[PDB]
Every structure is written in structure tokens, then in C-alpha cells.
């Protein structure tokens, strides 16, 4: 039994917290939609 309720508008913050890496990853995608790494 699931339900939904609003959590906020969808809009860009013009001066938000900037972080995060940008990794180039060799990955795969199975029949069940799961990603896995390739070495």
C-alpha cells in the first residue's frame, strides 16, 4: 500500500552547494536493469 505527497517544486538553485566527482566508469547493464563494473 503506497501513496504520494508533494515534497517541493522543481527548480534550479542559482547558488547551491557545489560538490561531487565526475568518474568515467566502464559499466554494464543486465536484463534486470542493474549496473555492474567492468575491469
Amino acid at each position: 500500500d503506497m501513496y504520494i505527497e508533494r515534497a517541493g517544486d522543481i527548480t534550479w538553485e542559482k547558488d547551491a552547494e557545489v560538490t561531487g566527482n565526475s568518474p568515467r566508469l566502464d559499466v554494464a547493464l543486465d536484463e534486470s536493469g542493474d549496473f555492474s563494473l567492468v575491469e
Partner: protein, 156 residues
């Protein structure tokens, strides 16, 4: 069908003890978009208030309610993006980041290297124009525990 105004939505369940947030979603143009592994294609409530699934695909790990997929924006493969994170019991939160790349055999996919608690799936990835370019929740974890979610987008 309840409140279908545009914006981000939490996906809640009462199947466990405490009211748990098992996912996030974006309502746009009358359609509720979210990850497949969140709802597993099951119908959703919205007050009273019900939404039937319209289209789904496990491999893409996406699903739409009350209509076809509406999110058509895409990452330019150059700019930074903001993850509108909606964690369980926590307020909506924007986190700006430069996406990596999931190098697959069938083209390459953008990827945000950000980790969040289980239940944040379906959070929309945004560009500097306010458009939804994909959803958060399906990806991998690397050598370090950190989560690298793909920028999962369907097609309008």
C-alpha cells in the same frame, strides 16, 4: 487522482512499522515519473486518489503513471547538474555536481557520484534551466563505498 500539480513527490509505504519513504518522484504534465524498483509497477495512492501505471520497463528501471513519459531533457555532457535530493524524513535538497560517464557497450550514460540513504530513488536530476534530465537511484558503488547513480532518463 489527487494533487497532480507539477513538482517533486515522496513515495511512502505503510507496509512497515514507521511510515517509510521508499522513493521519490516527479509529477509533470499530469504524469508521475519514478524508478521501477521503487513501486515495482504497483499502483499508487494520492488521497482518494489512485494512480494506475501507464508504461514500465525493468531494464530501464523507470515507470510512469496516468500517462506516457514526459521527461525529454538531457544532460549536455558538459555542464554541472543539481540533484534535487528528497531523503526520508528530510527536506528537499539541491546538490550541484558535474556528472561522470557510464561507459557502456551501447553508448555512454551520465552519472552523479553522490550517496544518499535507501529511499531517495526517483529524485530528479536538473540542469541550469530547471528541466528534469533524469532520475536518481540506479547505479553502482565503487572501490570506496560512495554511490555513483546513473542519470536515468526515458524518452518522450
Amino acid at each position: 487522482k489527487g494533487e497532480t500539480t507539477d513538482g517533486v513527490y515522496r513515495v511512502m509505504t505503510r507496509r512497515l512499522l514507521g511510515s517509510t519513504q521508499v522513493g521519490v518522484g516527479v509529477m509533470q504534465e499530469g504524469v508521475f515519473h519514478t524508478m521501477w524498483h521503487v513501486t515495482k509497477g504497483a499502483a499508487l495512492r494520492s488521497g482518494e486518489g489512485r494512480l494506475d501505471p501507464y508504461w514500465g520497463d525493468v531494464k530501464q528501471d523507470l515507470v510512469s503513471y496516468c500517462g506516457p513519459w514526459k521527461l525529454d531533457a538531457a544532460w549536455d555532457g558538459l555542464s554541472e547538474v543539481q540533484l534535487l535530493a528528497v531523503p526520508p524524513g528530510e527536506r528537499a535538497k539541491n546538490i550541484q555536481t558535474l556528472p561522470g560517464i557510464f561507459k557502456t557497450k551501447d553508448g555512454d550514460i551520465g552519472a552523479v557520484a553522490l550517496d544518499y540513504p535507501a529511499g531517495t530513488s526517483g529524485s530528479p536530476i536538473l540542469d541550469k534551466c530547471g528541466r528534469v534530465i533524469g532520475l536518481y537511484g540506479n547505479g553502482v558503488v565503487i572501490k570506496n563505498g560512495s554511490y555513483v547513480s546513473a542519470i536515468t532518463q526515458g524518452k518522450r
